[PDB]
Amino acid sequence: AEAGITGTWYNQLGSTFIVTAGADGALTGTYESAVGNAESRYVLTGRYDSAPATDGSGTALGWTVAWKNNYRNAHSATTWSGQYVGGAEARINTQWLLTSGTTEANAWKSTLVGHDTFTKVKP
Amino acid sequence: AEAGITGTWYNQLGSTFIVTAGADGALTGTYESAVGNAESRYVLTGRYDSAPATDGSGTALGWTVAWKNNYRNAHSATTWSGQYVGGAEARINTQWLLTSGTTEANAWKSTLVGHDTFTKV
């Protein structure tokens, strides 16, 4: 259900993720670090399962942020992949991949991997 | 097939991995970077499935290397997880995780991930 996913979410290191879920399966929004302020804000695009299995199953979703806005360009892109579990405490549990542009010789050490949990605070 | 893992293997970048596979699942040997000078060598240890399935499946394996020896200490460790495939053209197909010892503040950026394909050529 797109409604449960729509809102303001936060991760354990203080970053902010604002998102809207469209009825055709689209995800659109912005991602920002705890420094806050205008720019630390970057555009995000993703997809989710608009018709989830019933059960007590989670809803699968994923999104990308490329780290370039009008103030900085870090020359890297991050993708998060996980699932939305609703209830009193709704959470999005994920694993992420961060790739940096490198020359051919340093290509072998271009990607970092890690994991993030988001608690919701507003629609 | 099983014991086919013992030997000398090379990844796509010239690094050499020399391994011995024990009848009950142990993996032991050394790893050395390309250039090949005699301490670029570091110690490795691991485990593999010593009784694999009889349908056409590969043999599951894994191993670790901490990046310290008598000359250098790079305060890191790498693990490779994957499967051996035998035949006229034998290979070991893997993925790996490289973690560095960091402070609490840098803990989120401590691990890299990549993939490697080892052949006897």
């Binding site: 290191l13 203080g14 970053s15 670090s33 705890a34 420094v35 630390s40 970057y42 942020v65 780290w67 900085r72 870090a74 890297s76 991050t78 961060l98 | 989120w108 950026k109």
Partner: peptide, 6 residues
């Protein structure tokens, strides 16, 4: 440093 996390 990177902007993903502080």
């Amino acid at each position: 440093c990177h902007p993903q996390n502080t």
